[model samples]
Target: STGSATTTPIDSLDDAYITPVQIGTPAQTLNLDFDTGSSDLWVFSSETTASEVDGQTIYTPSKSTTAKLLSGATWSISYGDGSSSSGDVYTDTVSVGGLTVTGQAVESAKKVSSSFTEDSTIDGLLGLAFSTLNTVSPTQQKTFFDNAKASLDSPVFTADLGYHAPGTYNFGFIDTTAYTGSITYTAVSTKQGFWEWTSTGYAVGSGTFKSTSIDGIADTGTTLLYLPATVVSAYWAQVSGAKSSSSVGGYVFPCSATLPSFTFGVGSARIVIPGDYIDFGPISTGSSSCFGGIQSSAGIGINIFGDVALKAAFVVFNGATTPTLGFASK
Candidate 1:
């Protein structure tokens, strides 16, 4: 069986893509971020600290007959941004679109960081990465995709994100019409529990395509694209009035600056990011200084090919046998 689910960005900046997921016996629906960087399927619940509820919909396992607590099992996760959540574990029936997975581990958050609480659009996170990263113990639970792959027709999923429009996440089968040109498939490194891969090279605007290997993870949960310091600075240098200020955070420049597009090589394939997409938005209300969608990942050590990059292409996460990642222009 295959599953096809609709996912939409939270804002014009494409902060995060949320998809509706059904959990429990009666199929309580929750809007969750399908994150390729994480492996824990967690949700806001009655167990979550009341103070952190905000405006999110909470999942109450007590309301479902099929819910069963996994005694002594707990999970905790902290992201690169310093946001974190931790909770107890429960096994329940879960489904995405028409695909069903029984006995799925659903972590019930008892505590969440301020950033998560403030973000009301995201009720929870449904991890799509390797199950090896699941934090639940004494037994680490498999991710939703990991469990569903066994019965799926092709053990694969595709991500087609939009800039300011709606996108779709298809499971098991690849939508032939979703992308143009042949897909450029690359070997995936699942050792870190992420859909990680390496890029052949990159170029800013119409500049030379340097031959430098860039290793990064396809993280849907992240809002912006992060590359090495050299690559990020090269792009920003071309833009007038661009500056890297600590107060403004990362790189910022005049919103009116004529930004240049970026191109990254995937083997012989080249994916280009439109210039306008790089000008994220004003730093604040009515400010002339706009933040950049592409930032340096020097501090984090590992680069991240996030939503900004994904928006420019169709990403396929192949889970069958040795994992592979496919990128195609849309």
Candidate 2:
């Protein structure tokens, strides 16, 4: 059966949106972060040490008759943010929105990092990257999208993450009504198991769009946009009183600063991020200093077009051929 599903962000905090997903025969619901940066559908589970799980809900495989342990297999994942989770594997029915995938790999966590354990709202993560990125040892597992793609009318998904507002994650198909303007497409390189692409160039404010090329990944899991140190320095230089604050980390500027728009090129299409969005709110709620949403990707290696840059545009992740990425103004 060919079909599609649309998942809405259940909540947003610091721009990190969580989507609810159903797992197992009885369809136990869990609020999870739909991340494209990592590949592994893992959750807090009965296998997890009690101390490691705080207020997050657990996936009780024992409660689902359709759940079967994947003997000798295990999965583990660590994020650049220092959050991590690892556990044994199980095969079960997993559903997102109204779309379902049977015999999907579900990693049940036995240990989680302090960062994840303290995030009480998120139950786990739903990875949308290529199946090759799956961390299942000995036998790599396929993601929900990979397993369900054959039954979809088209192998595609769209992420419409909004600013402090609910957005939809459309699976299997693209809803034309969700975005306006022409969608510009660019080829994606999956060598790094990410939606990696090269930006034609970028410029701070209304400055001329330089011809320099930048290789970056579109990652939903990352909260901020990351560019090269030189690019970040150039952007911050335009803002009066902007300084690199070691106390607050990264670059910070006055809350009332009138910042300029930052624009980057995707093929011939130019996607601009508003300066106000770049403010990223106060450094710590009550402080006059505000953190920048765009920072240096130094030490991290590759640049990242995270939520800060993504929310400004509508994204179509096309897996049909050569994995193309389509972008348009929302």
Candidate 3:
């Protein structure tokens, strides 16, 4: 990742990443995080015969005519935090923006974890993040992105989660204009869809900080950039007046002005962590002030560069290439 950006060698990843792509009416749309781990798009379904909650948008397949079900087969999944759901599989001819793809896999509505159930206002999620990550057997044979790729004239998808602003999960044909130039791609290794790199050096306020060796996986599912405690504390020291808060845990500066632009090195590649996020306030009371871009956790085993860090850089999840995730210019 060093040497004046040599366009790092990337392995080809199959472009078959799939999601149960969803398209909302011009009036109302859904925010979908195309996860690779889970296969079904767990949207709130009007056909949710068993359960009903307040202010939820239930998908009425019968009304849409375009909606189809993967009848008989039941699909359900649980997360690390114990959130789960159960439902029948259905196929909805879905459209994203202008592109339309038939046979897009959609999960029937079912009660999920408190995190999902409480936030019932959301339309649903499109699980296009992974192609072969289905809970059911190969018999289901459904993925969001794979099916859509063949249908679209140009089968490229870009995610603009925080860049565009809060609450916007832009999908479909990537708006190249949103970025500075051609999207940079990195090779990704198969299995688990994880992308990791070593740090070259660390940086603060435009200057580089040394001896800050760090390594971690870049995960989209994680919202915070969890870093090793030693690394996080060392970087926090660089910022003027950085201190832990009693009201809020983790590190937050009394004044945003004191915050400096911090960058972490992975071997030769340097990824900058903006100052705004470095001020993520505090995760909870009694915890040291957490860095917005960098957080401290018990396990340093898998340092995670979550959405907070990914948003700073133009991330390309290039599964088409073996070892398929590349981070490039915005």
TM-score for each model: 0.98, 0.95, 0.72
Pick the TM-score winner: 1
Question: What is every candidate's alpha-carbon RMSD to the true fold?
Answer: 0.9, 1.7, 8.3
For each candidate, the alpha-carbon lDDT, in order, equals 0.93, 0.86, 0.53
For every model in order, what is the number of clashing pairs? 0, 0, 49
Write the number of the candidate with greater TM-score, choosing between 1 and 3.
Answer: 1
Model 3 lDDT tens row, 156-260:
445443532431223334445555645545444445534555454676667646755556666555556677777678777877667655455555654444466
- Top candidate by lDDT: 1
For residue 39, model 2's alpha carbon misses the true position, in angstroms, by 0.8
- By summed lDDT, the worst window of 10 consecutive residues in model 2 runs over 1-10
User: Candidate 3 — worst ten consecutive residues by lDDT sum?
Assistant: 1-10
Better of 1 and 2 by lDDT: 1
Error of 2 at 225 (Å): 0.2
Model 1 regions lying over 4 Å from their true place: none
Show pairs that collide, candidate 1: none
Cα lDDT of model 1 by residue, 97-133, tens digit: 8999999999999999999999999999999889998
Cα lDDT tens digits, model 2, 218-323, are 9988889999988999999999999988777799999889988899898988899988778776888598998898898996989999988888888988887579
